[PDB]
Coordinates of C-alpha atoms and ligand atoms in Angstrom, one line a residue:
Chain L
X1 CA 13.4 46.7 23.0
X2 CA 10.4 45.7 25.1
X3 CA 10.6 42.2 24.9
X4 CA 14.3 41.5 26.6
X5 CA 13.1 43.9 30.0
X6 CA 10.4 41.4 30.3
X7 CA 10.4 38.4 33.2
X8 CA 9.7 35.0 32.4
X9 CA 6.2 34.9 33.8
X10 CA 5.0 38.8 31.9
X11 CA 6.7 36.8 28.6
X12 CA 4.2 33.5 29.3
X13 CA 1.3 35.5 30.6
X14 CA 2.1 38.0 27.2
X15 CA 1.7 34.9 24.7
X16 CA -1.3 33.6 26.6
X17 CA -2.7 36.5 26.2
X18 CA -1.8 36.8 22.6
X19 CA -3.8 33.4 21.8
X20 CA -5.6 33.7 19.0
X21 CA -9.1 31.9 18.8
X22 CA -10.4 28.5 17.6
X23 CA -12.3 29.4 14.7
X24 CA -14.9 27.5 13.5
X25 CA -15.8 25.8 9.8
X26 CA -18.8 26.5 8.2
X27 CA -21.5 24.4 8.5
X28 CA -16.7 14.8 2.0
X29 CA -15.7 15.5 -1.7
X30 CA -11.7 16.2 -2.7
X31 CA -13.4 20.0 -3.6
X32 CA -15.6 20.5 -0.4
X33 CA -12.5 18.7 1.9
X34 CA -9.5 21.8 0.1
X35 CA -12.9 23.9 0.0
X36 CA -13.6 23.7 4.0
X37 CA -9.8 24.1 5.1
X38 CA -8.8 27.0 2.7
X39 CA -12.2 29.2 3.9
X40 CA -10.8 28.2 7.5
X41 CA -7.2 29.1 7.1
X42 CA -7.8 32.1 5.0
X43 CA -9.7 33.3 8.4
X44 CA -7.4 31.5 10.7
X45 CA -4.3 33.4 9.0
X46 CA -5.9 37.3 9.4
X47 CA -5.9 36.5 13.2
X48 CA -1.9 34.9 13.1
X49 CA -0.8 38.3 11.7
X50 CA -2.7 39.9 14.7
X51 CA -0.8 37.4 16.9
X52 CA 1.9 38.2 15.1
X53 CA 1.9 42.1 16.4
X54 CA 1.2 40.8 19.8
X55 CA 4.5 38.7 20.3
X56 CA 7.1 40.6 21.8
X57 CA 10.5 42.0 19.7
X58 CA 8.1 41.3 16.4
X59 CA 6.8 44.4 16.2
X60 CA 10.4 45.7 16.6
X61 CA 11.2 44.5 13.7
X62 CA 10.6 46.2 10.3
X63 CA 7.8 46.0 7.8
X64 CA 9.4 44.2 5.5
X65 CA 11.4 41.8 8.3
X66 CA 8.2 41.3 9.8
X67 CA 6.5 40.2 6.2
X68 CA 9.4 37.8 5.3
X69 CA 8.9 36.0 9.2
X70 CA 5.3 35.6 8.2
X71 CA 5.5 34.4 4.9
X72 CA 7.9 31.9 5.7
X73 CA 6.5 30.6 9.2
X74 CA 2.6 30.6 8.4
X75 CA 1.8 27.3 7.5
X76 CA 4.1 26.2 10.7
X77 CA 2.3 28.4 12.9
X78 CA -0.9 27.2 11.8
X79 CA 0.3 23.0 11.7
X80 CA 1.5 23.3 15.4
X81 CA -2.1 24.9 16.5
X82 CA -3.5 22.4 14.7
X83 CA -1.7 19.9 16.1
X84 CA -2.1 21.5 19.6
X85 CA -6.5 21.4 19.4
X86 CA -6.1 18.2 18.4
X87 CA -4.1 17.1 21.2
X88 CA -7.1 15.7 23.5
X89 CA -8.8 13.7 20.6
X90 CA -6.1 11.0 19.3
X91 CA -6.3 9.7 15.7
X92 CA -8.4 12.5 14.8
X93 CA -7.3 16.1 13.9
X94 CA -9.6 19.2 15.5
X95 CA -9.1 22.0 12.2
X96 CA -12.3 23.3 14.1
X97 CA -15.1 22.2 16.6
X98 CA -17.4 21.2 14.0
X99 CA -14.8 20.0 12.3
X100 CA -13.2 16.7 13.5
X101 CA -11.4 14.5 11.1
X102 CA -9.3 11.2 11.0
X103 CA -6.9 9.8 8.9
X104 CA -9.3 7.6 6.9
X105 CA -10.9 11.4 5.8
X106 CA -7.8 12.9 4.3
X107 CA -7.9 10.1 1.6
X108 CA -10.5 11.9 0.1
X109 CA -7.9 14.3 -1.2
X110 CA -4.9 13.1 -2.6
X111 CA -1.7 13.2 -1.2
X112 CA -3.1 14.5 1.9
X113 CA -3.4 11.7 3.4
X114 CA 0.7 11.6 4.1
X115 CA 0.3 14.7 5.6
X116 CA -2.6 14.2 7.8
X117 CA -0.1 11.2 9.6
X118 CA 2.7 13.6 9.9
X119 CA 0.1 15.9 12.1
X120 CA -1.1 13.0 14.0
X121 CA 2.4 11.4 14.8
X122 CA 3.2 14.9 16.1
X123 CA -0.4 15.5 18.3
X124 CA 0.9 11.9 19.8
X125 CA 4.3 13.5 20.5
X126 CA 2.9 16.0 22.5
X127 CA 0.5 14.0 24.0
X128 CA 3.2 11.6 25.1
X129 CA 5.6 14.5 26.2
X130 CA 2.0 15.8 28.2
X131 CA 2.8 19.5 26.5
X132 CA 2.2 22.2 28.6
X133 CA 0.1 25.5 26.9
X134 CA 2.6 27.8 28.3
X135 CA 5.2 25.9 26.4
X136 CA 3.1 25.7 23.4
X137 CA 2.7 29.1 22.6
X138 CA 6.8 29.4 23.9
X139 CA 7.1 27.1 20.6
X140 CA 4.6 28.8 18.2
X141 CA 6.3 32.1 18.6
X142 CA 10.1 30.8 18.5
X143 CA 9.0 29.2 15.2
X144 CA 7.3 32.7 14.1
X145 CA 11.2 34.4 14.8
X146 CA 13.5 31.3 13.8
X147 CA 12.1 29.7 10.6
X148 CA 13.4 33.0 8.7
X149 CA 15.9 34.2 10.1
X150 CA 18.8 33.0 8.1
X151 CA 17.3 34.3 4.8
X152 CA 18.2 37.5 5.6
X153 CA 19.4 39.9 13.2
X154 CA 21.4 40.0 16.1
X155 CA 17.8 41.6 17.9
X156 CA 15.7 38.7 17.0
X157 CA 18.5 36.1 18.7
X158 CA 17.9 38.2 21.3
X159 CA 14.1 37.5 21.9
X160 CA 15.1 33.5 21.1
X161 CA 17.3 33.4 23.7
X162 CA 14.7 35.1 26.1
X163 CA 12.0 32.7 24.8
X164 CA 14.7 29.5 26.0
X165 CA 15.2 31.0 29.7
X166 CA 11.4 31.6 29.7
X167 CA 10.9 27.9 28.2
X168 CA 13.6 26.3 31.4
X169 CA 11.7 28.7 33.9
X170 CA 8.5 26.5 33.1
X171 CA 10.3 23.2 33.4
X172 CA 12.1 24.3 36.6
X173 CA 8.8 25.5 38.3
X174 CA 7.3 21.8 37.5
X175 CA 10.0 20.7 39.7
X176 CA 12.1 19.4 36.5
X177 CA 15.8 18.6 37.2
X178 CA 18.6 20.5 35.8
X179 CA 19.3 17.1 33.4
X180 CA 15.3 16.8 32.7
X181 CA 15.2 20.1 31.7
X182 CA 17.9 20.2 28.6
X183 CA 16.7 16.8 27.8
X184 CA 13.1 17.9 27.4
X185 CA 14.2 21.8 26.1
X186 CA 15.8 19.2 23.5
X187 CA 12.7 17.1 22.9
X188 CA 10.8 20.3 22.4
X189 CA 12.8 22.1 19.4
X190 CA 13.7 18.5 17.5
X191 CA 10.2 19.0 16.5
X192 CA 10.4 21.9 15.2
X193 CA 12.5 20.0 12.6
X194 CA 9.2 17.8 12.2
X195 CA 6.9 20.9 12.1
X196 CA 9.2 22.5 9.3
X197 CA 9.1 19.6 7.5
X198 CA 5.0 18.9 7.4
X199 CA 5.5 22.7 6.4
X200 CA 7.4 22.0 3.0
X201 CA 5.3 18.9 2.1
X202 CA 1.8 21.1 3.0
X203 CA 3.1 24.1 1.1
X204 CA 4.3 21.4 -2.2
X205 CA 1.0 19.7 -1.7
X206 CA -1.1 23.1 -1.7
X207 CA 0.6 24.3 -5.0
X208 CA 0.0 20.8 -6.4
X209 CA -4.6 21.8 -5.4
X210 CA -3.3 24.8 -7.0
X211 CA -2.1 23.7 -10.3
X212 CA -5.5 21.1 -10.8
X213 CA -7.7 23.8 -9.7
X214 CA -9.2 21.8 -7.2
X215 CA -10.2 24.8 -5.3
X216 CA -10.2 28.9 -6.2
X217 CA -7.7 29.6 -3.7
X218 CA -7.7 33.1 -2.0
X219 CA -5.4 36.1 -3.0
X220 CA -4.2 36.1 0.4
X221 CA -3.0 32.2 0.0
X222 CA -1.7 32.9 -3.2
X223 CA 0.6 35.0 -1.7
X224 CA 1.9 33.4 0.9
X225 CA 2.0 30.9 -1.8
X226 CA 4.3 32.8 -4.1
X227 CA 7.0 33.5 -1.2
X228 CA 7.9 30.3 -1.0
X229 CA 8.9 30.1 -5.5
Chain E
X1 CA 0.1 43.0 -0.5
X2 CA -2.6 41.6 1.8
X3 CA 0.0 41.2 3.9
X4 CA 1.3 44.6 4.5
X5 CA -2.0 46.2 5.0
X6 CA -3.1 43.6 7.3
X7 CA 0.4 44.4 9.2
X8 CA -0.2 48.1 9.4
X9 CA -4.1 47.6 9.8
Chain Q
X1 CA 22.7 -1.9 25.0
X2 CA 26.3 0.0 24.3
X3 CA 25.0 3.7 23.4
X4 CA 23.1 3.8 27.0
X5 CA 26.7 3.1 28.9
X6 CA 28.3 5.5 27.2
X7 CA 30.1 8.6 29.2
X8 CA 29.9 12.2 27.3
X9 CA 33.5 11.9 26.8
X10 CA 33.5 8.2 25.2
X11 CA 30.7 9.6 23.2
X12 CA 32.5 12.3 21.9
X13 CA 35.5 10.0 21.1
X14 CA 33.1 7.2 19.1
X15 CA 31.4 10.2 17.3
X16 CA 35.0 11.7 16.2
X17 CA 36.6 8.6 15.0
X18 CA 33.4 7.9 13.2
X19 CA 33.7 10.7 11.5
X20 CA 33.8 10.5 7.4
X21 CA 36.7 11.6 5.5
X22 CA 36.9 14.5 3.2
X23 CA 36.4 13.2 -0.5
X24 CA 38.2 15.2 -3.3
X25 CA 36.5 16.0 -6.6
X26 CA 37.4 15.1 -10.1
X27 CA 37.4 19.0 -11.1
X28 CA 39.8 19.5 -13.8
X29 CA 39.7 23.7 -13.0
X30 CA 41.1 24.4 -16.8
X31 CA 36.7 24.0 -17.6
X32 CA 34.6 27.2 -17.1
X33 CA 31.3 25.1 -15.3
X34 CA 28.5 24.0 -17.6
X35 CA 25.1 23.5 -15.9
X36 CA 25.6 19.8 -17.0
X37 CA 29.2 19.5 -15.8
X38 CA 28.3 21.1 -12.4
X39 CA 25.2 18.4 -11.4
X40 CA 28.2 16.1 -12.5
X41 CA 30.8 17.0 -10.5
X42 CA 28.1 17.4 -7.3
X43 CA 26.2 14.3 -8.0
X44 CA 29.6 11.8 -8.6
X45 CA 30.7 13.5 -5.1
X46 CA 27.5 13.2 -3.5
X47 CA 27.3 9.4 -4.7
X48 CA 30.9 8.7 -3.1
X49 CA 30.1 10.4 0.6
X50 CA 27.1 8.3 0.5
X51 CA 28.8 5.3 0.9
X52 CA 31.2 6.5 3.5
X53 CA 27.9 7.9 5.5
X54 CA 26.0 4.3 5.5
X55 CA 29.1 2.8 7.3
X56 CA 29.3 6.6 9.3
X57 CA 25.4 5.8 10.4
X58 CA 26.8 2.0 11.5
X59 CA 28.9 3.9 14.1
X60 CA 26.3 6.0 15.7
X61 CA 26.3 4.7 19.3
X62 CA 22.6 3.1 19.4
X63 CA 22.2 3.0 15.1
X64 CA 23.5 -0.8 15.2
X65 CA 20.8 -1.8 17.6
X66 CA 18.2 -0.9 15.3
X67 CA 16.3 -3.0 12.5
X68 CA 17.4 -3.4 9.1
X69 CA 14.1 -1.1 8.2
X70 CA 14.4 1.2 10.5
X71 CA 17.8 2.2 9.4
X72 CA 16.8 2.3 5.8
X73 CA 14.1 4.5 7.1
X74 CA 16.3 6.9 9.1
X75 CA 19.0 7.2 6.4
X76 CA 16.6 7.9 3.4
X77 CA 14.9 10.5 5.5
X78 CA 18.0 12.0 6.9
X79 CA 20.8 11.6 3.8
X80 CA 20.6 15.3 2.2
X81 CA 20.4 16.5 5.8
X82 CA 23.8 14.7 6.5
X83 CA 25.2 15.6 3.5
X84 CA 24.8 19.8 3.9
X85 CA 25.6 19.7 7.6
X86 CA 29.3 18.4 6.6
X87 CA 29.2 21.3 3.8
X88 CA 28.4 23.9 5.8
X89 CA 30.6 22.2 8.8
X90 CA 33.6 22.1 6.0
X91 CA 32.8 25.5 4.2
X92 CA 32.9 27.0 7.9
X93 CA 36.6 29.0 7.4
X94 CA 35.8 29.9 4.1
X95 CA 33.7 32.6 4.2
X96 CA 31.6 33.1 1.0
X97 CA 32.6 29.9 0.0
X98 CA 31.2 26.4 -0.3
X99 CA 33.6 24.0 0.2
X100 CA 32.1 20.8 -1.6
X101 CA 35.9 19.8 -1.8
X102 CA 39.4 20.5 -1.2
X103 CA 39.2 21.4 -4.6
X104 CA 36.3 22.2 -5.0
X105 CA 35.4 25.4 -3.6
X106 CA 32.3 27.5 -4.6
X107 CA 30.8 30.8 -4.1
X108 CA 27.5 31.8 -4.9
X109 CA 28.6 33.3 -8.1
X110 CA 29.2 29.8 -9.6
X111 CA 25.9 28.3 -7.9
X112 CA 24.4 30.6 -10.2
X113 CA 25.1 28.1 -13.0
X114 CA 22.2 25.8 -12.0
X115 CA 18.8 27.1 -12.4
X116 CA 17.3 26.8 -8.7
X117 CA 20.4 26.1 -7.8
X118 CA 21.5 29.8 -5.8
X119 CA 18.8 29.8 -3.7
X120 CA 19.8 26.8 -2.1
X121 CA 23.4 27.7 -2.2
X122 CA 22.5 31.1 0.1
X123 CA 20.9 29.2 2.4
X124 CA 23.9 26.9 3.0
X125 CA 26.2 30.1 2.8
X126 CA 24.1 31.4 5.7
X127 CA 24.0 28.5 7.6
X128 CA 28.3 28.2 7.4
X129 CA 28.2 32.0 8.5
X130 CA 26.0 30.9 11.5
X131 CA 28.3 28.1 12.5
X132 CA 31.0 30.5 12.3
X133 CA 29.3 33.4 14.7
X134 CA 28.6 30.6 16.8
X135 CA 31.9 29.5 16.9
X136 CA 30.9 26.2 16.4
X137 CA 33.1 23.1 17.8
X138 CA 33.8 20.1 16.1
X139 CA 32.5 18.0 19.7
X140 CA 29.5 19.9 18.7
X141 CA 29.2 19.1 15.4
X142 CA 29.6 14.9 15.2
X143 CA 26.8 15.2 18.1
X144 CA 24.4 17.7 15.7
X145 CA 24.8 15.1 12.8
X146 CA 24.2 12.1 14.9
X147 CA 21.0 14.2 16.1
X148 CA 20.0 14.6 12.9
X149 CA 20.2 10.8 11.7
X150 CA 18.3 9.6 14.9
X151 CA 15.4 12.4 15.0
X152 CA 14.4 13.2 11.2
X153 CA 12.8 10.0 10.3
X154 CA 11.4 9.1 14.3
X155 CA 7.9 10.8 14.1
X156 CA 7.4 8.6 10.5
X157 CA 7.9 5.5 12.8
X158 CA 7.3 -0.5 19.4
X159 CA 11.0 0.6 20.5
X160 CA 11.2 4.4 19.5
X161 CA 12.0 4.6 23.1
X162 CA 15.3 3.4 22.6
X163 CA 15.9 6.5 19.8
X164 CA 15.0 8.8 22.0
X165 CA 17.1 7.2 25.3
X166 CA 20.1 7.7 22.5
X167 CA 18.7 11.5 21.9
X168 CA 18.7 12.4 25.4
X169 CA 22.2 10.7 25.9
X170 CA 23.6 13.1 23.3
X171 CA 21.7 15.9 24.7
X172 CA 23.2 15.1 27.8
X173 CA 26.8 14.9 26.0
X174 CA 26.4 18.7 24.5
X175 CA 25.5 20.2 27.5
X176 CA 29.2 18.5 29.2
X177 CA 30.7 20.1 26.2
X178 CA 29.1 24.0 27.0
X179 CA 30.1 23.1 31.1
X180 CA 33.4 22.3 30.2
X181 CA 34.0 25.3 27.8
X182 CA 33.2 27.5 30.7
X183 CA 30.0 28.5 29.9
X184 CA 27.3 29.6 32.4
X185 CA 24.0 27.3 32.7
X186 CA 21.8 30.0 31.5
X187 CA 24.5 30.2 28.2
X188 CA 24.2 26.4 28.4
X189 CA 20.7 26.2 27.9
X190 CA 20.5 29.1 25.0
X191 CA 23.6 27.9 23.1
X192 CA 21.8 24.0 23.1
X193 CA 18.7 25.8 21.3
X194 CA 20.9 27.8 19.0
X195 CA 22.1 25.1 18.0
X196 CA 19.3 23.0 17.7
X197 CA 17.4 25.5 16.1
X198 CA 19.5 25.0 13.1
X199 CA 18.4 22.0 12.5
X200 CA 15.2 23.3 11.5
X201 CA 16.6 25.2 8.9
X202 CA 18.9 22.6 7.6
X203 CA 15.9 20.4 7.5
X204 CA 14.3 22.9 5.1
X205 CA 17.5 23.1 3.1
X206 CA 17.0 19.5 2.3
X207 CA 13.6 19.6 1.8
X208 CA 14.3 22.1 -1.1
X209 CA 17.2 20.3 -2.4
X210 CA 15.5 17.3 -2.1
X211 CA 12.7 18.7 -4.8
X212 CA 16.0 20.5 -6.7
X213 CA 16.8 17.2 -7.7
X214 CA 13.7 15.5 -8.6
X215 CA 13.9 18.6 -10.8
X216 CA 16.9 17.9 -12.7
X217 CA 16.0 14.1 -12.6
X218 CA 12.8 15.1 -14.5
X219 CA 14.8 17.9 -16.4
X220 CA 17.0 15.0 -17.4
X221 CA 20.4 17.4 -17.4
X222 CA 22.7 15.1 -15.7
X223 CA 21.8 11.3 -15.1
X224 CA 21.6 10.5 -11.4
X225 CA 23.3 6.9 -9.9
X226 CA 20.9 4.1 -9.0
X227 CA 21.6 5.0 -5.6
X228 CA 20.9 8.8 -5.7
X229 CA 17.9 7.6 -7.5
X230 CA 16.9 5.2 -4.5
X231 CA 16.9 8.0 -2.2
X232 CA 15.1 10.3 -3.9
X233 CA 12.2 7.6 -4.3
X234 CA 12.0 7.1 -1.0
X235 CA 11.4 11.4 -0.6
X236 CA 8.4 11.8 -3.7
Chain O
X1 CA 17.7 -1.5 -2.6
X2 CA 21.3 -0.8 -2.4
X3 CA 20.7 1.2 0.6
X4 CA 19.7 -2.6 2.1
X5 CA 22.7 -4.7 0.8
X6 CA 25.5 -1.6 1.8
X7 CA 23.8 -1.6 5.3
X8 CA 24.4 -5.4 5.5
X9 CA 28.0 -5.2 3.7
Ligands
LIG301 O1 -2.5 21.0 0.6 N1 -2.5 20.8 1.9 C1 -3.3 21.5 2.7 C2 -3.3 21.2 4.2 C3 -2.9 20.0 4.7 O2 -2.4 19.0 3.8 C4 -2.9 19.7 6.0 C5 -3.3 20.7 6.9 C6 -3.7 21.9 6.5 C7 -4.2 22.9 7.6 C8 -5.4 23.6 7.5 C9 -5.8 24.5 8.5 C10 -5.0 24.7 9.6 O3 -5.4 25.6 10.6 C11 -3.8 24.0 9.7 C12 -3.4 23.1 8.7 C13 -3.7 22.2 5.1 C14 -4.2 23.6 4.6 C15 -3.4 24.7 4.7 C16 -3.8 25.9 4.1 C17 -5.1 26.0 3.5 O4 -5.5 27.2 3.0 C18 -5.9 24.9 3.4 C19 -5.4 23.7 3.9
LIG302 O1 19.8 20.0 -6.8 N1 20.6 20.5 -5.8 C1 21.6 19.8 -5.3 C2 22.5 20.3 -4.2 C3 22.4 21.6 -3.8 O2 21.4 22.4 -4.4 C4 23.2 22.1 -2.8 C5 24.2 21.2 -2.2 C6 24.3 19.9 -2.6 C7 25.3 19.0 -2.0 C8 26.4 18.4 -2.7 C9 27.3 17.6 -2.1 C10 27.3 17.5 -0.7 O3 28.2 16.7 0.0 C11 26.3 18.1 0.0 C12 25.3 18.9 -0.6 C13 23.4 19.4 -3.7 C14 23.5 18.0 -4.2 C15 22.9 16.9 -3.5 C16 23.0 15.6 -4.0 C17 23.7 15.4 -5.2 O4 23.7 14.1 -5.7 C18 24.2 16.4 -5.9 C19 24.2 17.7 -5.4

């Protein structure tokens, strides 16, 4: 592999690099609300699966490995960005610049609105915890390997493990103590549990749009969609 | 799929 | 508070005396499985370790402290989770196997006898054939479960310092375990995410069983206990 | 809520 010969600093500097951008919206009814953030994540998901190929030990992996990681992680991957842009503006959630919303706007589409609290308690989690972006993007890519994993490996525990040294080599550098460093390492990776949860109750919620046609939604979407039934 | 061209591509 | 004064050891102790007993089934094994007879059997069991799981939660080091609501809260968030993480935990030697109870053990085969049922039965297979790679100990496990009830209902909400004080302490409690066990603090730090990584999955696990049975609610196939039914309407 | 009355005995 290429991934497990790296340091913790080319692994960090590797992901940074990897960073895809903050897209923008294009320039609120329940059809214009689902019809603003499907456009956004239809464009926002093209430039995962080019982040995607850009994570170390993923490209490793097999075509159809690397397709079964995606499709279960996606909505994850792109919940825990959100979460991080929107880190810096409290009770609001940043989906893009020109696009700045609070809670009070995700009533406009139903059920949403459950969801849109999920995101914010979790932006107030790593506001509180003061999340670093070189453990963000640790996070974003352990999700990307771990989510799927068990529905299949030994290579991709590999990278994970690789991905926690790098993670304690960041707390240890911020003069962290041996103790504050599992403690937070521990912090960190209970919210994946969170993150995986907003997943299941965004991916139920987009199938419910999907049965009242609320929007047309994109035959990328769709099948992400149909991995998860 | 989308996916697997986008993969390759 | 009591949690907070805690040593890893006498936290390991309280966790493992805490601990639920197995419950048996009322599987009469001279019936091939109807789909009806199967939600039966699962649901009747389910409905018994629930009770012994709300006096369980009472003897979590730190659970007591909390409100009335707050424990509802936690335990209707956290139930299902509970619940697979001692299948899996039990269903550990038995590989292939789901060990629902002493005699009541399943493969995948008869999971097959539930529609939508299989799926969810592979992912509990795979998560008993990580435990067992991992070699996971039973100090390890009470600590995972009592993770589980304290975390998966935090982030839905003054004091959730206090849950997280309690988090930490049990952190600090598997990491004694992985020093003790002779394991280096680089294999420290990698087996605590393993295993917490887990949790992930078993959180998804739930969430899928969780809308498995507001399936067969709907589907009316086997009539759930006002219980059952009180935690599922507190999960849509 | 039985959950309630079973937390409280
Ligand atoms: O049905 N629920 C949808 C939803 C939600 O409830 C909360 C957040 C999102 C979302 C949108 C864009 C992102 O970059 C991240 C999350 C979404 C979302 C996810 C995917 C879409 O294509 C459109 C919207
Ligand atoms: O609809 N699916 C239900 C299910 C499943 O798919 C897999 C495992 C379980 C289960 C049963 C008993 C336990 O102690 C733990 C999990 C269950 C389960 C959960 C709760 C019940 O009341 C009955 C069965």
């Amino acid at each position: 592999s290429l991934a497990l010969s790296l340091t913790a600093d080319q692994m960090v500097s590797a992901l940074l690099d990897a960073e895809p951008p903050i897209l923008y919206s294009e320039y609120f009814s329940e059809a214009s609300m689902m019809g603003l953030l499907t456009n956004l994540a239809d464009r926002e998901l093209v430039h995962m699966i080019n982040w995607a190929k850009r994570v170390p030990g993923f490209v490793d992996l097999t075509l159809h490995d690397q397709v079964h990681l995606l499709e279960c992680a996606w909505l994850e991957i792109l919940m825990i960005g959100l979460v991080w842009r929107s880190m810096e503006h409290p009770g609001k959630l940043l989906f893009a610049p020109n696009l700045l919303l609070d809670r009070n706007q995700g009533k406009c589409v139903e059920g949403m609105v459950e969801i849109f609290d999920m995101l914010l308690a979790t932006s107030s989690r790593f506001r509180m915890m003061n999340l670093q972006g070189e453990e963000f993007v640790c996070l974003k890519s352990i999700i990307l390997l771990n989510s799927g994993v068990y529905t299949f490996k030994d290579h991709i525990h590999r990278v994970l493990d690789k991905i926690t040294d790098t993670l304690i080599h960041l707390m240890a550098k911020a003069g962290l103590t041996l103790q504050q460093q599992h403690q937070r390492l521990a912090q960190l990776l209970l919210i994946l549990s969170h993150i995986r949860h907003m997943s299941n109750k965004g991916m139920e919620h987009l199938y419910s749009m999907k049965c009242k046609n609320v929007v047309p939604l994109s035959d990328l979407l769709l099948e992400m969609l149909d991995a998860h039934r | 799929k989308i996916l697997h061209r986008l993969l390759q591509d």
